[PDB]
Amino acid sequence: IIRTPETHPLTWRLRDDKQPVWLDEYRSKNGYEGARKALTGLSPDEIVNQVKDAGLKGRGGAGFSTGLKWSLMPKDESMNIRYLLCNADEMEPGTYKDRLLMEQLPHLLVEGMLISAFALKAYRGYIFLRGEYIEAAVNLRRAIAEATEAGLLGKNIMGTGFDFELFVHTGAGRYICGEETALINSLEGRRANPRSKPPFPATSGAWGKPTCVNNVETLCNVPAILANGVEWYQNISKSKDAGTKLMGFSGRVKNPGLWELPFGTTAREILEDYAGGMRDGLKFKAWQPGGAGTDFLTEAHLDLPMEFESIGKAGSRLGTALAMAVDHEINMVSLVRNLEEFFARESCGWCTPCRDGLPWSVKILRALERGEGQPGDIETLEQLCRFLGPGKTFCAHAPGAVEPLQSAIKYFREEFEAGIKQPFSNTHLINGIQPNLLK
Amino acid sequence: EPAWQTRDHLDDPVIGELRNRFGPDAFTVQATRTGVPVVWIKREQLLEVGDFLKKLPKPYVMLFDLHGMDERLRTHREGLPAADFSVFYHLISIDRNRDIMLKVALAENDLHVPTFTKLFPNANWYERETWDLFGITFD
Amino acid sequence: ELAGIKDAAPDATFRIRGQKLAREPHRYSGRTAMRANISVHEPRQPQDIDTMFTFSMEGNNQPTAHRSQVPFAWAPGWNSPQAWNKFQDEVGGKLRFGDPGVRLFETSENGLDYFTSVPARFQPQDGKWRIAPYYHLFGSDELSQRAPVFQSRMPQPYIKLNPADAAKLGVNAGTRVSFSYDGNTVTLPVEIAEGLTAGQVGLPMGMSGIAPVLAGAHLEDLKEA
Amino acid sequence: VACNLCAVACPVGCISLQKAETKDGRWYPEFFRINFSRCIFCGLCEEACPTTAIQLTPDFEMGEYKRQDLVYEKEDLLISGPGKYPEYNFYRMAGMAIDGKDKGEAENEAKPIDVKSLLP
Amino acid sequence: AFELSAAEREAIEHEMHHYEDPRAASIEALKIVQKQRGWVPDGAIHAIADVLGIPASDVEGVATFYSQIFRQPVGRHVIRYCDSVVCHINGYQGIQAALEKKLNIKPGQTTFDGRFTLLPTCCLGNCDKGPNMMIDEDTHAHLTPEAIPELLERYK
Amino acid sequence: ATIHVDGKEYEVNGADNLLEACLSLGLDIPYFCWHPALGSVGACRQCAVKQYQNAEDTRGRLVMSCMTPASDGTFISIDDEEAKQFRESVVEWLMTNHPHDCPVCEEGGNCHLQDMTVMTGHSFRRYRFTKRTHRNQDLGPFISHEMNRCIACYRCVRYYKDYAGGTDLGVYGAHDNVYFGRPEDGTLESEFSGNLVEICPTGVFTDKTHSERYNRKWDMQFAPSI
């Protein structure tokens, strides 16, 4: 499959031997042209408005528009100290797009942070990276050294007077650190408890200073916009969500992989025309569109375009757009138990409903797995779904935790009914006391 | 609706009869869980209300109870007339199978009520006990 | 000058709608068994002719009672120290009818003059040790050291020395030195206080055997025992 | 466990007791006296006991010559067996650690997990 | 008895050069101590607190918060197998059973000779090549239960 | 500022949050992690009410009264069915790991968690699984430590570190194994560490000097003194 630079702005310069692209090869293949144009011929407000009217949305999984997030930075000239953070955590199960993005294209991320830091007037930049991406860390550090030697980073970048210093902050292995306020707290050397918003990090983020946090893929989408223009970016696809997106299917398919597709590409083309469909002897049962924190969908939802509004209207989320396919051999109770065990052991412990209700769901699903389920367990799971939604917990970790549970209860309830075998028993008999026989 | 719900009993025909006889501003209807219509009557209209209830088409013929209450320490007196003490009169009409609780508010210094013995003779001992335990004088 | 103490608290005739203020809660227990070993007959309740409080539960402790002296916070449904929220006008503010206590004096219209007695600088004289006061929250108070639970929290009695003074005396940290004050030789172990200025020796005030009036005094023949 | 629930639930207020603690950390009454000249034998203390320690037994022959001898101390109340509830033990339910029962050894309780453990 | 080495201390100060607050180098200081000594001992918390100028309670809370900072002693090699949803679909349980059979230990435990420490871990970002295992610095994908003891013999 | 609580109009301070404004009016909202001297953090998720956009609104949304300002023209409901159910669910979740310890606990009869368990109306247990446990620490001669009773409301660490300025108390651990205490056994070094016995809404931090000769709150003869 040919990857022209006009329709594959991110992955057209990948090498066929899966090797990283360094500074000379990157600059030979139209590298740092958008950074040069932005830093020389464009004001920071012009770059912010260009990203805004290009329609670039957040690729972290929420779909918030990046230009509006950049526009809510304070207009006071007294706040000269500003921070740009790259959320290179990518700790969601089913998500592997940032690893491919910086393990073999680090200079794209470096250029994107350079452009975003000039646009945001960000004096410092940090790449909050997970500790498990060692090769990505090595490639990013080598690319930072190469860009500093070439004058692309440091003091007096391109002679324009703009000074930008970029660091890589390798994390210590916790899933909640991907939350942007928890990311800021972890960057400050604290426990990664998230923060209540308002105030948003644009007003008071890292060390009280104005801070903008963006995903790896958004910052990789930035230089293509700055180099080729807005009119090219809006004409990539005829959909509401502008630009391309890294989509792909994972789990017992013929080609579990990663491709760059325009928005509006239906999930059946990703599963069959790209991933090759299910493996031999396996039939399709369900799929999660955007990682471990999204609602399950059935075969009837496979003919749906992978946009935010289209997947949102089906009772799920687009998320990271890396779908995971479940075949008929996988029990839904075991899968949801694995998901909830992950979500319960990756809680940050701050707020009560997640911290004290995800283990209850884990224990209920464990009881349903071994057939020790008792009546009222699924009603308890449904109430845990209802009372861990948005606004009930301090952050959005627990709504994403309870989305697969409620989608599996909705679509595959007969597998959950099969675990309830024992009668309900919470009390043991105490001799000499007649119990209250509640009918 | 459960039997313990708070009701004002404005659908009671005695409330409408008292509205048509004494006027809407003459007394205050209190919503309680007693199950009975509680009407706060002004003191100078107490014997008139007693005569009117005794001369109804289905009269209130029995003074079920008559006693007092110290309202000085009562903090939750919302929707109630200002009172330091109060005297309540529980009256039963057997023909209607209904009953009504009249309440007379009293200040701490003017603790005197017109006596109820000309309408119901059990008010003798009831008012003697109310004077004994609360200090309310019955003229 | 002490005429304001009359308005500190209301007198013993103060009542809340005729009743006194309760010292103990309404669910106080054991009344017919607290003294049953001494005598099975219940004694007379202790009368308080001095103040408006009573030695019983037959009193007023309503959160809406018009008073400033609250013996304890309790509300129906609020048994914790969060009942003080019920006892306030607004939560975290003042008491509902004013906090107790009255200032004896107001701010004067005119002030003092400048004190021209500027002292001379501290000169470390040979053979005399200025007693620098050291205070401890557990131990300096006269009555708090008598509390037996404090002796685990009360520090050991040391004496503080400068590194230069300790090197001049040839003493280390932890060794015992003896000093005579008013013809009384007492020995104490030594810590090395780095921030203490030379020519001074540091004594913990209010301790066992160290009176607080020793602060600012001088010491003689402070030597290793 | 000297929790004083029976003393406060007594409508006569004829129970007096004081909490003491052993070196292992279990609670017990330092003393326990009931003024049986005041007690109305209403069983509210037994109803309020969360350990089934205090019990009302089928015994009515309690006549006395002096009223001071109707004050029964802990020596006159503590019997050698379980009484009407032969198997209930509160300290098997409680989370407090005592002798013979460390943390996590009670009913429906898991072993304590250290914060320094390597598991996520 | 703990004492920070000179190289550890200089690396810590170079880390606090990167931030406007010295507290922000606590995670990387703990990681430096962990890389030098395998884990973070009890006195390392007070040493890092003394160097950084922050209380030791915050350093202990950070060390106990993060799963990749080990406050208990581990073996010379740490096996971390993914147990998330995609590797559950790809069958990590056979890999875990093979690991428990070869090492004769449960997850979270250490081999009797101190060579291997078996640990579950969250998604490694390699779901398209699952199941995945992460030994000390190397990630291994496309795992099979037959290749587990062959793979384990190259880590002496 | 004008608020409407359950259809009744109230005049409050717009600079206050909804929880302290509603507690100043005499209304009862359960809460754990908010203190008047410490401020609002939105941790325990117990103070939930239902806020409406306007007067003619029926759906609403669950907000937290400690984290919501009591601005002018606010419309909230405390006795809403969903808010009551969520507050009872929060008490139930806190009660899943709580030890059966009230008779042998020095906070009994003086416990904020007891009052809020009764206030939310939660008296039936349907959780049938195990409860997490914690070892205790020796915190010195004044404070007794019992970490099984913790509800992870972060009042102790907020008071001790932000307010009192102490250094040796902190929060350690993770998802449901959060531990509140010292990094090692030793005496609490703050001169105001004794306020933890009233700051903590549970019996984790208790007056050991009182715990020697312990008696319940209802059995005390109290006086106002200096």
Ligand SMILES: NC(=O)C1=CN([C@@H]2O[C@H](COP(=O)(O)OP(=O)(O)OC[C@H]3O[C@@H](n4cnc5c(N)ncnc54)[C@H](O)[C@@H]3O)[C@@H](O)[C@H]2O)C=CC1
């Ligand atoms: N590894 C991954 O990529 C993971 C991604 N996610 C995604 O995270 C999403 C939730 O992200 P959150 O940040 O918790 O929620 P969110 O949707 O509220 O925030 C997303 C972005 O929008 C910005 N934003 C929203 N409203 C704003 C306003 N009024 N003013 C200023 N900025 C505003 C935030 O600053 C943030 O950068 C989920 O939809 C999920 O798909 C979740 C888990 C893991």
Ligand SMILES: Cc1cc2nc3c(=O)[nH]c(=O)nc-3n(C[C@H](O)[C@H](O)[C@H](O)COP(=O)(O)O)c2cc1C
């Ligand atoms: C529990 C949780 C975990 C998250 N983890 C990540 C993550 O690992 N990587 C990421 O880019 N965003 C993550 N996010 C989303 C961020 O909050 C935020 O949307 C993102 O870092 C930047 O937004 P953007 O999409 O505009 O770039 C997470 C959100 C939540 C609630």
Ligand code: SF4
């Ligand atoms: S939902 Fe609450 S406890 Fe869970 S990760 Fe978010 S803030 Fe932490």
Ligand code: SF4
């Ligand atoms: S039975 Fe006796 S001791 Fe027990 S509560 Fe009743 S009166 Fe008190």
Ligand code: SF4
């Ligand atoms: S007898 Fe029962 S209720 Fe009374 S103090 Fe002992 S354990 Fe508590």
Ligand code: SF4
């Ligand atoms: S802290 Fe409160 S709820 Fe917990 S055991 Fe003690 S009294 Fe009971």
Ligand code: SF4
């Ligand atoms: S120990 Fe007490 S104050 Fe601290 S978080 Fe736990 S319950 Fe709250």
Ligand code: FES
């Ligand atoms: S689920 Fe195992 S690598 Fe992602």
Ligand code: FES
């Ligand atoms: S008091 Fe508001 S969430 Fe805790």
Ligand SMILES: [Ca+2]
């Ligand atoms: Ca006196």
